[PDB]
Design a binder for these strands. Structure first.
Lengths: 97, 106, 87, 185, 161, 123
RNA sequence: AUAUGUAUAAAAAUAGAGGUCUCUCCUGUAUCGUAGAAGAUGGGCGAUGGUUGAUGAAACGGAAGUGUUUUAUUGACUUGUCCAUGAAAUUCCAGAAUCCAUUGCAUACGACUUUA
RNA sequence: GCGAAACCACAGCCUGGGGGCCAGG
RNA sequence: GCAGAUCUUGGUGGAAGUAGC
RNA sequence: CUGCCGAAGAGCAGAAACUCAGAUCAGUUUUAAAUGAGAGUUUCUAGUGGGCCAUUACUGGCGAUGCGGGCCGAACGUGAGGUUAAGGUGCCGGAAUGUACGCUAGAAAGGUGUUAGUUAACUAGCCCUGGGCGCUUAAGCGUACUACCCAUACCUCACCGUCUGGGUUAGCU
RNA sequence: UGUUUAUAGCCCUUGUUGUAAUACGUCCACUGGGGACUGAGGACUGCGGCUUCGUGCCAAGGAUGCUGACAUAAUGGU
């Protein structure tokens, strides 16, 4: 409900495995943080939630499997690097996405 | 030119009312470019909001937003009826609202 | 009337029939050849009354321009001036 | 399409139609400026509005065409309420075209134009001439100032058109305009 | 919209009376027929019955014709007879013009008007109206008048030419 | 230069035939006219002048011509590509095409007009 | 004396105007600007470009001219074109006046004219 | 310097229509 | 079981620092 | 304090007692049965026996009755949503500066003012004479077709209350 | 000016392409979406439907499931 589906030509995505992306893959870290009653006071133990390496590796692997598909067809690289924004005279009820 | 805008400008016209009785619970909103009840069917269910200033730094900001939703068309000339979580103040007649594009179906 | 059209140059720019003016009454001029086809397309009886006056006024101005003579004993202007002189 | 400030050339517009259009805009939070209010037109012969005004003369009696239009808008607004008085302060009706406004685009209201609303041959009065007969005495200078502004604006248009000629010629010169002209631009 | 309706009826071997009248729908047509029959041959509405109610279309709907309509007016005095001619492409089309015209000029209502007869005059000589004759001239050519044509506050003044 | 007469070709601007191109065949009265078009999807109908604009093009046509012969007359005098010759049709078709682009095609036009503005060479 | 790009300037007519005997109008659904970690960091090709911030100016704008240009620099960006790095776990939307004094051209009293 | 009293629903701009109501000034 | 009875009793107002001595 | 019933303007309102779809009725209509409703009685015991408006002495309405419109509409528990009546959609004001057809101040007779017709004379319509702003191929007048606005009204649901009817004991883990 | 499809064509009747087409009316226990309001009830009992019978399943005697934000706040009152 928060995406505009455009009529731009589709990108070849069949070449990247997607079955690993499940509900558990995107879930948030369950509340925990095993702590003892001397460091919770004087609260300097909080680690950071920096994205682990395999998330970066999966992102890079997806980029490798996606870049040739977007490079071959013209204007894809500049289109995706762009941003969508309305201006005066643009009427969304009449513009065909 | 600058862009970064994902909303359609709208005006808070008035409340729903008869000649002498007013209903603050429903508001009349005129959207830019929507001039018929056929085009007003597009904006139904969208989220309309009223954004204003204040003085207290609520979470470190002077901005305040009253959200809402477009409910149905009103009349023939593209006016719509908008329901807001808090009824809009009467002093905001002719003010400028923001009709976001979500939830989207096109 | 449905069509009550009637008859130097006849240039009808901005309803001015400069050979003169016709802005006062909506009747067309159309400068049809040497004549000025002074048309009325479904107008009003006032337009029919004006055209009979306009046709004579245009003809009198054209006659006066070509040869106004004296007629002691500018057409309307001369007659009004003569009446003013007499008064 | 609405914005914050609009300038309306009142020439060829009817008094009631334009005021009603203006009043609805003002109550919607839109600041409206009406220029050349002495070129406003009124349906009916000159004497009809003339007897209307002298009956009004028989309350403050104001003769200026700009304030004639201002009264017309005022009756179309809830002036007794704080909301109406707020709307009225957003309206700047002036005669002629002040220099701050002659350098900006001026829109016209098709729903109020005399050509689109009056049958040809219908007698019509002009507010400027009507005002000049009921006490207003500034139409000579207003008309004279209009000619000077019109002459200066005409020279600006010629300069703008001359500059437009260069870019217009250079438009089709570039082959890109014809390379992908199929997009409709 | 108005519609032509052929109504045939008779009192419960009584003679069958058929006539053409213009009504918005069938129910108005049958009541109108009964009222017309009541004032012609004095047949009671309750006693009589309708044997056939059929709708009539225009055989030549895309051909311009001239229709002569004879009707009975009810006025302040309530007694008047006129005849008027209309040029259009349908019998029902002229009737709407007839009703619109008389409600305009003479301030009439649909109930006070009864159609006496409507005929199609195909002879130009038979036309008795100057406007109809002028419209039938072989050189009919006139500029379109009364043109005059949301987006309020247009940017440039209308051309209107 | 725009006289409502038999044979003049008109453009419909109201109803479901907006943008369709038709020609007057007969003058019903002072408020209506009968039109026709060679295009099959345009039927023979009687419409009012409030829905049309009088195109300056004029075609020779006998009064009361049938639908089929009107198409032959239109083909004979080559009204097609003659209406398109005028700048009026070019602007209308360009606007009609400009109403169809998706976001990609609009972004292509973004780049195209960027490739055209950069020169601004003047003497 | 002290506010979400806040963009768009001829006149007059709808029973005609503008531009070079010819052409156009029939609305702006148009035109200018519009990709960038809210706009990052580099390299090449083609023209002397475009956008500007700060100085230095000169010409114009008097109806309410508070704005228009021409520029001479300086400091930046430049997507005109094509490539190279970075964005992430915000892991689905939120120095005067007066009093006091003084003048009588003024005066019921104030006020005014004076000086003072 | 001394010092009341009666009285007080509430208050105080006009015109017209039905001193506050309606529409205007 | 109070809002009123030009209710009863007490207290306190505007009039008013007015009229006035 | 809340609830329920509720007039009048002998009759009208309840309470007990009985007798009850296997009973009679009706501000109704057909004919010379249809349809709705369960029908009644003895007894007592409070209140009133004004007037006003309108159509034709009658009939209603006002009065004990607020709400939408400005007489028309509509009989009222607390709300949500939908839809409407009357009246409306230029602005004030919620809603089409809608579409289409027409006429030109407006919401006894006169006129060389006008538009359609009848046989120079008459007929019909508008103009002169006898809520505001504003409006003029209307935002005036008439007809037709759509769309729109909103009542305490209509429909759906929730909730409060009252009334009517039904269930509920070897009190079953 | 007068004529009868020629170097335009038009009107009327019949046949034919004919089980035309379309508009209108009406119907489907045909179907695809968008928007808004509501979630009363509280073990099973019922009426139905699929499923071979199934403590089977189901949109069938009234809402559940999946998530996110906050305690220095979110939210609601005076």
């Amino acid at each position: 409900r928060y995406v505009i589906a455009t009529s731009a030509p589709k990108i070849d995505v069949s070449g990247v495995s997607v079955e690993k992306f499940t509900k558990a893959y995107f879930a948030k870290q369950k509340r925990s943080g095993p702590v003892k009653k001397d460091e919770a006071f004087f609260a300097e133990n909080a680690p950071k939630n920096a994205l682990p390496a395999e998330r970066i590796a999966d992102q890079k692997a997806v980029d490798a499997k996606l870049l040739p598909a977007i490079k071959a067809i013209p204007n894809m690289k500049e289109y995706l690097a762009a941003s969508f924004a309305l201006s005066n005279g643009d009427r969304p009820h009449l513009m065909k996405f | 030119a600058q862009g970064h805008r994902l909303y359609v400008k709208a005006k808070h016209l008035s409340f729903q009312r008869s000649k002498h009785v007013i209903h603050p619970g429903t508001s009349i909103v005129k959207i830019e470019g929507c001039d018929s009840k056929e085009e007003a069917q597009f904006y139904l269910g969208k989220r309309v909001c009223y954004v204003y200033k204040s003085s207290k730094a609520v979470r470190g900001s002077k901005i305040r937003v009253i959200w809402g939703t477009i409910a149905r068309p009103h009349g023939n000339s593209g006016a719509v009826r908008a329901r807001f979580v808090h009824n809009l103040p009467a002093k905001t007649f002719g003010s400028s609202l923001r009709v976001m594009l979500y939830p989207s179906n096109i | 009337d449905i069509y009550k059209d009637e008859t130097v140059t006849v240039d009808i720019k901005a309803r001015n029939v400069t050979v003169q003016n016709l802005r006062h009454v909506d009747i067309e001029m159309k400068k049809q050849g040497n004549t000025i086809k002074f048309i009325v397309w479904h107008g009003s009886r006032k337009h029919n009354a004006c055209i009979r006056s306009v046709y004579s006024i245009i003809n009198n101005m054209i006659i006066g321009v070509t040869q106004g003579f004296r007629y002691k004993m500018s057409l309307e202007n001369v007659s009004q001036s003569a009446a003013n002189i007499k008064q | 399409e609405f914005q914050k400030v609009v300038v309306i050339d009142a020439k060829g517009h009817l008094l009631g139609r334009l005021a009603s259009v203006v009043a609805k805009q003002l109550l919607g939070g839109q600041k409206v400026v009406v220029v050349r209010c002495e070129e406003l037109n009124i349906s009916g012969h000159f004497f009809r509005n003339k007897l209307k005004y002298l009956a009004y003369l028989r309350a403050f009696h104001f003769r200026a065409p700009s304030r004639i239009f201002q009264k017309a808008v005022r009756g179309m607004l809830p002036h007794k309420t704080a909301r109406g008085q707020a709307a009225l302060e957003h309206l700047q009706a002036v005669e002629g075209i002040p220099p701050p406004f002659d350098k900006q685009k001026r829109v016209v209201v098709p729903a109020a134009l005399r050509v689109l609303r009056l049958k040809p041959g219908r007698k019509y009065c002009t507010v400027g001439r009507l005002s000049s007969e009921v006490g207003w005495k500034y139409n000579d200078i207003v008309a004279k100032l209009e000619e000077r502004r019109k002459v200066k604006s005409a020279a600006f248009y010629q300069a703008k058109l001359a500059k437009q000629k260069k870019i217009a010629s250079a438009k089709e010169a570039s082959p890109v305009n014809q390379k992908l002209s199929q997009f409709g631009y | 919209a108005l519609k032509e309706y052929q109504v045939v009826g008779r009192k419960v071997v009584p003679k069958l009376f058929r006539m053409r009248l213009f009504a918005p729908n069938e129910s108005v047509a049958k009541s109108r027929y009964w009222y017309f029959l009541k004032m012609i041959n004095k047949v009671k509405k309750a006693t009589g019955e309708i044997v056939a109610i059929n709708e009539i279309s225009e055989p030549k709907p895309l051909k311009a014709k001239v229709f002569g309509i004879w009707i009975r007016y009810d006025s302040r005095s309530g007694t008047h007879n006129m005849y008027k001619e209309f040029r259009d492409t349908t019998r029902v089309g002229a009737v709407e013009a007839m009703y619109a015209d008389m409600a305009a000029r003479h301030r009439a209502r649909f109930r006070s008007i009864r159609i006496l007869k409507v005929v199609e005059v195909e002879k130009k000589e038979d036309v008795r109206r100057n406007y109809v004759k002028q419209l039938l001239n072989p050189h009919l050519k006139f500029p379109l008048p009364h043109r005059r044509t949301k987006k309020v506050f247009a940017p440039h003044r209308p051309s209107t030419f | 230069k725009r006289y409502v007469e038999v044979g003049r070709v008109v453009l419909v601007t109201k109803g479901e035939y907006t943008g369709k191109l038709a020609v007057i065949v007969d003058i019903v009265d002072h408020k209506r006219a009968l039109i026709d078009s060679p295009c099959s999807e345009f039927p023979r109908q009687v419409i009012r002048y409030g829905s049309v604009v009088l195109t300056h093009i004029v075609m020779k046509l006998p009064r009361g011509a049938r639908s089929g012969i009107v198409a032959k007359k239109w083909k004979a005098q080559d009204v097609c590509n003659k209406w398109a010759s005028s700048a009026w049709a070019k602007k209308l078709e360009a606007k009609k095409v400009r109403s169809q682009l998706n976001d990609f095609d609009r972004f292509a036009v973004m780049r195209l007009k960027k490739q055209r503005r950069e020169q601004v060479n003047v003497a």
